[PDB]
């Protein structure tokens, strides 16, 4: 499509162009307002529920961050600098308050600010048009006072619209506007064009005039609520409410009581729609809201101990603040599944007699009350009480509770997305394997008859040879002779393969517990080779095969290796992953949303897909930019081309076009300047991506007749190439730039003698700003060019090994959990100590004889048989040995004392649970 | 790792329902036919034997109060069928546990060494785990003799 | 369109249920069967008011199953083509609006929407609004939609609505 | 080929009667109460739950007496069941609005009588 061509040609970051709201220049006032708004609503707004900070880059912030946010806003909106560029080459302006992730948050809230501004503009135009149309009637007949039903759309309303700081307040303003002017807008449209519900019943009947005689205006009452006292004294009227009602009695409201009912409804609706009242009540709910949960008929039997909603099956007077992590998300999911019903309220339920138990309605009843004993005052007071009662229960309680529930659910989803981002960042932060490279990836299937496939990959991840071991899964210690012979034969075949190929490291898939057996067999073979000194030490690693499985499923693996079986394909993927996790992850996760196939969070499917994908790709962009991308390597190795899209300011389209041009010219990216001279890259995109693209000058060699810049293979930006050359010259203490740079690179030890502080003052003097961080980065790059900042690879620990092989986590495998196990034998030591069982996850359970039954057991043989299935409760877990103590006592299963069941919610309504199952028993 | 049932048919794309219950689109060539397990075993909450084409109720799991007929079976998953269900073409997937109830002697030559047929010799045409059918070379008749009364005649 | 009719349905009773509560079982199975059924002829079936009668059960030769014809007055909801009906928005996006009328799910396209309403993707909740912004249609709102199209879908009719006509909108 | 534009409906609707959103909601909630009082009963369909909440939200008349009064008022007029049900469950606020909503309405009964009838409907509405 022409859109791709336009993006390719535009001199802007591809993601910036792809943004839904086009990025536009921001004036100084707009930047200041946006920065303050972003800081208030993104960093200075604590969540109502308990959410822990996800910030992991740090190895809260005060008002000082407002300036950093403003600088970031200027960089993106005006200078079109992407977040990675700002975080890597504009640190002096955003750090230390703002990191790359914080800059992403600022960019997102910049979008939110832009949309809020657009809405405010639209509502301002509507308000001005209404102000004019309403003034049209006054213009014709100024003498006639405005009817009680024609409220004044005064500057107070205009300013209230201008003071909106959130969407909720914007909606409050709009609803207030619609309550009074909603009816007349179609006439407004007709008048402007030519020149170029229960409420209306009371309006037509004239009850609005009676509604104005109740004592206070909605704004006055809202002020009274805000200040928590009688700021405005209700004005009393001589005639009784009924006496004034009979005046307004008509066919619509025949009885005075009906007239009063309509007026009360008008008062209640106006109070609910008053924006000041809405803001005050919103704060009250955000301060005193509590959550109550009651299971349905379905959940009373479905929400058992193993259910994720068992903990909060019953909730009573649980403040929303107590909710933590995705607890609200789980509660909402249970309600969506019909297991329970929720309720958000600001008054205690079933806590009668508690000190200060008066509801918010009782508390504010005196804010619209007249303290007199006269009968007329009492009647008006009753009318006021009922009016506010209706306003609150009918409108305010329902709307505010729904708003709070939405906010809590959003917070829970945000926490889940944060957890997913943390997991992806951890996976992508693993550095390439460094032997104490040639990698032999070994994969096997859970079936016994299935073979074991080994794939050998050279340093560049290209498959060179493979080995098939039909009977490698068999045990060399198996009693059967043919099985031992088959295992031995495979052992020698692998021994010769290892001897000849000499792989630097062997990675074994963590398919199941048998992976440990394969690790032992491979380690023993390597031990034999090192024992005879025929081959150097070969690293042996156990690698999770989730990514390898995804690559095996991906049709890309089929295209690359059509003849390679799935097990061999996943073996190749495992070897590539250990070689370079970032490249493997990027290649495996394509544009077809294959990333979501990975298990990031158990509830990752209940969060917004776009938010999760955006966060994950932000992690990919951050890691790709930090590590750097080699264009020549990508060209020679197509599978590594997936990093260019993640490169800052390039995206999939520009990256693909860059490869297209390079392959069309049949040349290499010899220098960064070629991105402009040859590839015709725009200056802004070049600024964004030049420092994140690496060229291996040494690999280029003498074949590149054109001038070769040594700094092109370093993080040093072309804009700071002269600074790097000056740094080298000062380091060598000359009294040429390309000679000094080469010598300092060979012997960078002289860099420490440099006084970069003075050079910083010199740059500031000549108009370059503070560059101490940049100078330090330049010196570090000169000491080591493109030093890998990823965490060094380390073998998985016992906890990780247990999780990878058993596919179990502490949340799902815990003491007291009810499980199912199959007897595999009797533990002996004639004399016996218990029953041995095997779980479906590979964990070997053990049931002591005493725990084998409620009553004394003489011989376990009659109690259990081989292959029989027994329901057991976990007592102890030994992840290191993949063992688990189990008990099958009937009393233990019953768990009358609730000793084994998981902890319940703090506000669990045990009284409600007891009554519910007692009535069920009845 | 994942097996599904085709629930919708289209000119170009396919909407195959996997064990997990979600809907994923694939092409005609990529998807390969898998044989159905006409006889498979599984497990349920009640700890009773469940077979294929058995009416069951989803009292718990992804679906609530749902009735269907099993069409395909997996170790820990099962495919249910219905005609009143608009979603997923009337086909859905639920866990088996969550679901609740709603030869070597053949061809050898044997000598009957005990009983009224002692001394007779025949060829085993079909032998059960306890009894075997011996066609007698002499009497033109096949008889059922307890396998404990047979001894294979070695050459 | 909500309606009340007297319909007839034949149910086969397995002889297992030939106990004293035979009629109770008959009515229970009738509920379980007819309730919720959507048919082309009678639209959707909302509920069953009452059972008019239980015709004499016939014993099918060669099968103990007894066929009972039962008449019963039950509520239905069969929409039509070209009738304004109340609806509840349930999700708003750029492609079109989604609304609900009891069991029937209706939707509105960018043609059925008048030329005044526009797509506002920048809107956090997608919405249809004109330059004047007089009327904004968001999720859960009540709209008056003249049905236009209908279609049986696996024994479950789904309808498409429209609001291009005058005044068809929020009120 | 059946709609409110031509009013041509099958013999089944010719014989049977129409119901309004309000009374439909009342019957459905009564049956809900009936099945709740019933014990060990099949879990009722989410579809009826959906229709129930829909009709309850769009319930124009809140009482059996109000339903009966509006029904009698509609009966008084010589109007077809389809038109009566449509106008009652839509509660048109204006005569022109009702005409626009129901094409068959215009040209059948005249404007001031229509306006009086719909005003009576509004007054009945609480």
Coordinates of N, CA and C in Angstrom, one line a residue, chain A residues 338-414:
Chain A
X338 N -20.0 -16.0 37.1 CA -21.2 -16.2 37.9 C -21.0 -16.9 39.2
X339 N -19.7 -16.9 39.7 CA -19.5 -17.6 41.0 C -19.8 -16.7 42.2
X340 N -19.8 -15.4 42.0 CA -20.0 -14.5 43.1 C -20.5 -13.2 42.6
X341 N -21.1 -12.4 43.5 CA -21.6 -11.1 43.2 C -20.8 -10.1 44.1
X342 N -20.4 -9.0 43.5 CA -19.6 -8.0 44.2 C -20.5 -6.7 44.5
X343 N -19.9 -5.9 45.4 CA -20.6 -4.7 45.8 C -19.6 -3.7 46.4
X344 N -19.6 -2.5 45.9 CA -18.8 -1.4 46.3 C -19.6 -0.4 47.1
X345 N -19.4 -0.1 48.3 CA -20.2 0.8 49.1 C -19.3 1.5 50.1
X346 N -19.8 2.7 50.6 CA -19.1 3.5 51.5 C -19.6 3.4 52.9
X347 N -20.5 2.4 53.2 CA -21.1 2.2 54.5 C -20.9 0.7 54.9
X348 N -20.7 0.5 56.2 CA -20.5 -0.9 56.7 C -21.8 -1.7 56.5
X349 N -21.6 -2.9 56.2 CA -22.7 -3.8 56.1 C -22.7 -4.9 57.2
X350 N -23.9 -5.0 57.9 CA -24.0 -6.0 59.0 C -23.0 -5.7 60.1
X351 N -22.8 -4.4 60.4 CA -21.9 -4.0 61.4 C -22.6 -3.0 62.3
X352 N -23.9 -3.3 62.5 CA -24.8 -2.4 63.3 C -24.3 -2.3 64.7
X353 N -24.3 -1.2 65.4 CA -23.8 -0.9 66.7 C -22.4 -0.5 66.8
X354 N -21.7 -0.5 65.6 CA -20.3 0.0 65.6 C -20.2 1.5 65.8
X355 N -19.2 2.0 66.5 CA -19.1 3.4 66.7 C -19.0 4.2 65.5
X356 N -19.7 5.3 65.4 CA -19.8 6.1 64.2 C -20.1 5.3 62.9
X357 N -21.2 4.5 63.0 CA -21.7 3.7 61.9 C -22.6 4.5 61.0
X358 N -22.9 5.8 61.3 CA -23.8 6.6 60.4 C -23.2 6.6 59.0
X359 N -24.2 6.4 58.1 CA -23.8 6.4 56.7 C -23.4 7.8 56.2
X360 N -22.8 7.9 55.0 CA -22.5 9.2 54.4 C -23.7 10.0 54.2
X361 N -24.8 9.4 53.9 CA -26.1 10.1 53.8 C -26.5 10.8 55.1
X362 N -26.3 10.1 56.2 CA -26.7 10.7 57.5 C -25.7 11.8 57.8
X363 N -24.4 11.6 57.4 CA -23.4 12.6 57.7 C -23.7 13.9 57.0
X364 N -24.1 13.8 55.7 CA -24.3 15.0 54.9 C -25.8 15.5 55.0
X365 N -26.6 14.8 55.8 CA -28.0 15.2 55.9 C -28.1 16.6 56.5
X366 N -27.2 17.0 57.4 CA -27.2 18.3 58.0 C -26.6 19.4 57.1
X367 N -26.0 19.0 56.0 CA -25.5 20.0 55.0 C -26.7 20.6 54.1
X368 N -27.9 20.0 54.2 CA -29.0 20.6 53.5 C -30.2 20.6 54.4
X369 N -30.0 21.0 55.7 CA -31.1 21.0 56.7 C -31.2 22.3 57.4
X370 N -32.4 22.6 57.8 CA -32.7 23.8 58.6 C -33.0 23.4 60.0
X371 N -32.3 24.0 60.9 CA -32.5 23.6 62.3 C -33.6 24.5 63.0
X372 N -34.8 24.1 62.7 CA -36.0 24.7 63.3 C -37.0 23.6 63.6
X373 N -37.9 23.9 64.6 CA -38.9 22.9 64.9 C -40.3 23.3 64.3
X374 N -40.3 24.4 63.6 CA -41.6 24.8 63.0 C -42.1 23.7 62.0
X375 N -43.4 23.5 61.9 CA -44.0 22.4 61.1 C -43.6 22.6 59.7
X376 N -43.6 23.8 59.1 CA -43.3 24.0 57.7 C -41.8 23.7 57.5
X377 N -41.0 24.0 58.4 CA -39.5 23.7 58.3 C -39.4 22.2 58.3
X378 N -40.1 21.5 59.2 CA -40.0 20.0 59.3 C -40.4 19.4 58.0
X379 N -41.5 19.9 57.4 CA -42.0 19.3 56.1 C -40.9 19.6 55.0
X380 N -40.4 20.8 54.9 CA -39.3 21.1 54.0 C -38.1 20.2 54.2
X381 N -37.7 20.0 55.5 CA -36.6 19.2 55.9 C -36.8 17.8 55.4
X382 N -38.0 17.2 55.6 CA -38.3 15.9 55.1 C -38.2 15.8 53.6
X383 N -38.7 16.9 52.9 CA -38.6 16.9 51.4 C -37.1 16.9 51.0
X384 N -36.3 17.7 51.7 CA -34.9 17.8 51.4 C -34.2 16.4 51.7
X385 N -34.6 15.8 52.8 CA -34.0 14.5 53.1 C -34.3 13.5 52.1
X386 N -35.5 13.4 51.6 CA -35.9 12.4 50.6 C -35.2 12.7 49.3
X387 N -35.1 14.0 49.0 CA -34.5 14.4 47.7 C -33.1 14.0 47.7
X388 N -32.3 14.3 48.7 CA -30.9 13.9 48.7 C -30.8 12.3 48.8
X389 N -31.6 11.7 49.6 CA -31.6 10.2 49.6 C -31.8 9.6 48.2
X390 N -32.8 10.1 47.5 CA -32.9 9.7 46.1 C -31.7 10.0 45.2
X391 N -31.1 11.2 45.4 CA -30.0 11.6 44.6 C -28.9 10.6 44.8
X392 N -28.6 10.3 46.0 CA -27.4 9.5 46.4 C -27.6 8.1 45.9
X393 N -28.7 7.4 46.5 CA -28.8 6.0 46.2 C -29.0 5.8 44.7
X394 N -29.9 6.6 44.0 CA -30.3 6.4 42.7 C -29.1 6.6 41.7
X395 N -28.3 7.7 41.9 CA -27.4 8.1 40.9 C -25.9 8.0 41.4
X396 N -25.6 8.7 42.5 CA -24.2 8.8 43.0 C -23.6 7.5 43.4
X397 N -24.3 6.8 44.3 CA -23.7 5.5 44.8 C -23.5 4.6 43.6
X398 N -24.4 4.4 42.7 CA -24.2 3.5 41.6 C -23.1 3.9 40.7
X399 N -23.1 5.2 40.3 CA -22.1 5.6 39.3 C -20.7 5.6 39.9
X400 N -20.6 6.1 41.2 CA -19.3 6.1 41.8 C -18.7 4.7 42.1
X401 N -19.6 3.8 42.5 CA -19.2 2.4 42.7 C -18.7 1.8 41.4
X402 N -19.4 2.0 40.3 CA -19.0 1.5 39.0 C -17.6 2.1 38.6
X403 N -17.5 3.4 38.8 CA -16.2 4.0 38.5 C -15.1 3.4 39.3
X404 N -15.3 3.2 40.6 CA -14.2 2.7 41.4 C -13.9 1.2 41.0
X405 N -14.9 0.5 40.6 CA -14.7 -0.9 40.2 C -13.9 -0.9 38.9
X406 N -14.2 0.0 38.0 CA -13.4 0.1 36.7 C -12.0 0.5 37.0
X407 N -11.8 1.4 37.9 CA -10.4 1.8 38.3 C -9.6 0.7 38.9
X408 N -10.2 -0.1 39.8 CA -9.5 -1.2 40.4 C -9.2 -2.3 39.4
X409 N -10.1 -2.6 38.5 CA -9.9 -3.6 37.5 C -8.7 -3.1 36.6
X410 N -8.7 -1.9 36.2 CA -7.7 -1.3 35.4 C -6.3 -1.5 36.1
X411 N -6.3 -1.2 37.4 CA -5.0 -1.3 38.2 C -4.6 -2.7 38.2
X412 N -5.5 -3.7 38.4 CA -5.1 -5.1 38.4 C -4.6 -5.5 37.0
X413 N -5.2 -5.1 36.0 CA -4.7 -5.4 34.6 C -3.4 -4.8 34.4
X414 N -3.2 -3.6 34.8 CA -1.9 -2.9 34.7 C -0.8 -3.7 35.4

